[PDB]
Enzyme design. Structure first.
Site, PDB file in Angstrom:
ATOM      1  N   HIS A  90      27.001  32.922 -49.592  1.00  0.00           N
ATOM      2  CA  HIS A  90      25.316  32.952 -49.847  1.00  0.00           C
ATOM      3  C   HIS A  90      24.620  31.515 -50.654  1.00  0.00           C
ATOM      4  CE1 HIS A  90      25.178  37.557 -49.881  1.00  0.00           C
ATOM      5  NE2 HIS A  90      26.088  37.026 -49.203  1.00  0.00           N
ATOM      6  N   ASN A 106      23.275  28.888 -47.546  1.00  0.00           N
ATOM      7  CA  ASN A 106      23.852  30.207 -46.874  1.00  0.00           C
ATOM      8  C   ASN A 106      24.286  29.741 -45.209  1.00  0.00           C
ATOM      9  OD1 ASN A 106      21.013  30.837 -46.135  1.00  0.00           O
ATOM     10  ND2 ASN A 106      21.295  32.475 -45.118  1.00  0.00           N
ATOM     11  N   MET A 107      25.557  30.194 -45.015  1.00  0.00           N
ATOM     12  CA  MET A 107      25.721  30.300 -44.361  1.00  0.00           C
ATOM     13  C   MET A 107      27.057  31.260 -43.144  1.00  0.00           C
ATOM     14  SD  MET A 107      28.268  26.507 -44.610  1.00  0.00           S
ATOM     15  CE  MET A 107      30.121  27.370 -45.635  1.00  0.00           C
ATOM     16  N   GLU A 108      26.146  31.348 -42.189  1.00  0.00           N
ATOM     17  CA  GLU A 108      26.776  32.887 -41.533  1.00  0.00           C
ATOM     18  C   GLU A 108      27.600  32.730 -40.384  1.00  0.00           C
ATOM     19  OE1 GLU A 108      22.934  34.133 -40.191  1.00  0.00           O
ATOM     20  OE2 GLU A 108      23.103  34.985 -42.219  1.00  0.00           O
ATOM     21  N   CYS A 134      26.335  38.076 -54.998  1.00  0.00           N
ATOM     22  CA  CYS A 134      25.804  37.061 -56.036  1.00  0.00           C
ATOM     23  C   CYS A 134      26.148  37.228 -57.188  1.00  0.00           C
ATOM     24  CB  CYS A 134      24.906  36.001 -55.527  1.00  0.00           C
ATOM     25  SG  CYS A 134      25.011  35.738 -53.644  1.00  0.00           S
ATOM     26  N   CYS A 162      21.699  39.292 -54.231  1.00  0.00           N
ATOM     27  CA  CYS A 162      21.868  40.659 -54.383  1.00  0.00           C
ATOM     28  C   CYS A 162      23.242  40.792 -55.526  1.00  0.00           C
ATOM     29  CB  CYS A 162      22.724  40.243 -53.021  1.00  0.00           C
ATOM     30  SG  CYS A 162      23.968  39.584 -52.863  1.00  0.00           S
ATOM     31  N   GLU A 184      24.001  31.215 -53.110  1.00  0.00           N
ATOM     32  CA  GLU A 184      24.230  31.398 -54.214  1.00  0.00           C
ATOM     33  C   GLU A 184      25.592  30.182 -54.681  1.00  0.00           C
ATOM     34  OE1 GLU A 184      22.154  33.202 -53.339  1.00  0.00           O
ATOM     35  OE2 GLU A 184      21.276  34.576 -54.254  1.00  0.00           O
TER      36      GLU A 184
END
Ligand code: URI
Ligand code: URI
Ligand code: MG
Ligand code: ZN
Ligand code: ZN
Lengths: 297, 297
Positions: free
Chosen positions: A104, A91-93, A134, A131, A106
């Site tokens: 996400h 994941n990347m934020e 995804c 979630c 996924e």
């Protein structure tokens, strides 16, 4: 590889049976966050484990690539492409950016398989249960109705079991083709090499709802170029913008975002949307010195 | 207009048993896209129908509010708050903006119920199965485990049936509290009244993951004021930004976004994200002449 330090922690916990071989592969300079079918066969033989168990045991290698400065919640995913190759994702934020810019694990693992040429996903093994966002993203794929989802020791399940009575491309009178081969045939005489690279990404993009075929190319300090194609979704919000896809390829290839020197965005002049404002805003939170070249075509 | 015409079309399709009274309510000059428990009970008695079938019958009134310049796919939703009052909602799309700015009917109806004071959802009625993004949005609510989801001629279902082994607030160590009573108690001596109104919305906002408590206030040319509070989601992408919420309130009151005169955004100085860039970018595709006042508090 900017993530080797965290990868080493994950390796330190891997079973003794296959750790030495895995270490040889994942700490190699050119490790591309993928495992070939032959390498996977060797991991199986060495581990003595059943397929599902081995994929689950490998998740920490994927989770080691997570960039989660907002949540500090590290998610890894492993996508087995229909060819048999395995593709890692995390994941990347993006601090300072609206949450629609989040990627996400996924989405990351799937975009990784796609940008590398897979025509579909056979299965995906995930750190945590996927979630709804995804699940809905996965329903855009060519293999929506056949891919299997695997959580730890739990029975594998099909997307339909995770997303009953799903909404998808069919509901908008369109076929589910994310990952199908395409060539939009766009062409430009622009002399900027980074624009021409983004254009190659635009040419394989999926955007049947806004017709905003588009792509991003990121040039690194090292000279390497990473492409990202737009992956639109029937539910609209789960769409993965091209920047996010390019950043994901760079990240999975072991690059640091602090090493991005230039970006290029190319999109459709007749698209019902534009990624320009969000591409500029997100690049600004990453590094305001990164220049963005732009072409509407 | 298109909206008035769709409502008229919807009314003409209602059974004569309750069409006359429905007409009377829907065409009232003060109709606010809601039906009191009493008005609904009366419609129910006039119709002679069972509860679930009347709600489904009213769906085209909600869908008439749809603003879908991209897809032209009109979705309507009816949320019954735990008070008994019914709140309508419809999808909202923005030409020229990235798709994370989209609002689903379910999000619109729920935010409508939330902004008018409801502390929970009893049931939500809809024409199609909710996509994964909406299922994820609903999983953030105080009533996620008790609400019912009603589709045409089908039995009511729980969110758990639509979203098995869900990911949600619990996975991040947090209670599911969207719609619970909130007062952050923030103040400001800013002399601009529109900022004071945006702050009223910020003071009830939901942002446990980024702490970017935030709100937007929109002022119409008429002088009508619409407020929107940030509704953040544990899955991140399904978070509903504050501009989106205020536009939803404007839309359900029958306003045209061409009639928006000014906007104000108020957010927290310690937030891990910012809504500025996206608020300016979306207002810009609506009308570049709309000024945006801003305060980071
Ligand atoms: O299925 C999921 C759920 C969440 N996340 C990540 O978890 C964090 C909180 O939701 C975000 O970074 C989000 O992308 C995933 O990668 N996959
Ligand atoms: O459950 C759903 C699925 C889709 N949409 C809307 O339908 C259009 C196409 O997905 C978009 O405007 C989207 O917001 C909804 O309102 N609800
Ligand atoms: Mg509770
Ligand atoms: Zn997800
Ligand atoms: Zn939805």
């Amino acid at each position: 590889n900017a993530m080797r330090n965290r990868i080493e922690q994950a390796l330190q916990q891997m079973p003794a049976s296959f750790a030495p071989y895995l270490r040889e592969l994942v700490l190699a300079k050119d490790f591309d966050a993928t495992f070939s079918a032959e390498q996977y066969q060797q991991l199986l033989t060495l581990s003595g484990l059943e397929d599902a168990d081995l994929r689950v045991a490998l998740l920490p290698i994927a989770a080691a690539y997570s960039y989660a400065p907002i949540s500090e919640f590290y998610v890894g995913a492993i996508v087995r492409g229909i060819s048999g190759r395995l593709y890692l994702g995390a994941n990347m934020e993006f601090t300072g950016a609206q949450l629609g810019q989040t990627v996400h694990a996924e989405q990351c693992a799937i975009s990784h398989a796609w940008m590398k040429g897979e025509k579909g996903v056979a299965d995906i093994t995930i750190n945590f249960s996927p979630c709804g966002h995804c699940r809905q993203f996965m329903n855009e794929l060519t293999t929506a109705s056949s891919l299997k989802i695997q959580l730890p020791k739990r029975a594998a399940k099909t997307l339909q079991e995770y997303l009953p009575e799903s909404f998808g491309p069919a509901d908008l009178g369109i076929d589910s083709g994310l990952m199908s081969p395409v060539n939009h045939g766009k062409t430009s005489d622009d002399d900027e090499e980074l624009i021409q690279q983004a254009l190659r990404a635009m040419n394989i993009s999926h955007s049947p709802y806004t017709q905003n075929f588009s792509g991003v190319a990121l040039k690194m300090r090292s000279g390497a170029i990473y492409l990202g194609a737009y992956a639109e979704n029937a539910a609209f919000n789960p769409s993965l913008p091209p920047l996010q896809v390019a950043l994901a390829q760079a990240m999975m290839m072991g690059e640091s975002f602090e090493d991005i020197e230039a970006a290029a965005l190319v999109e459709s002049a007749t698209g019902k949307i534009s990624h320009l404002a969000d591409t500029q805003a997100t690049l600004e939170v990453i590094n305001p010195d990164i220049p963005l070249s732009y072409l509407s075509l």
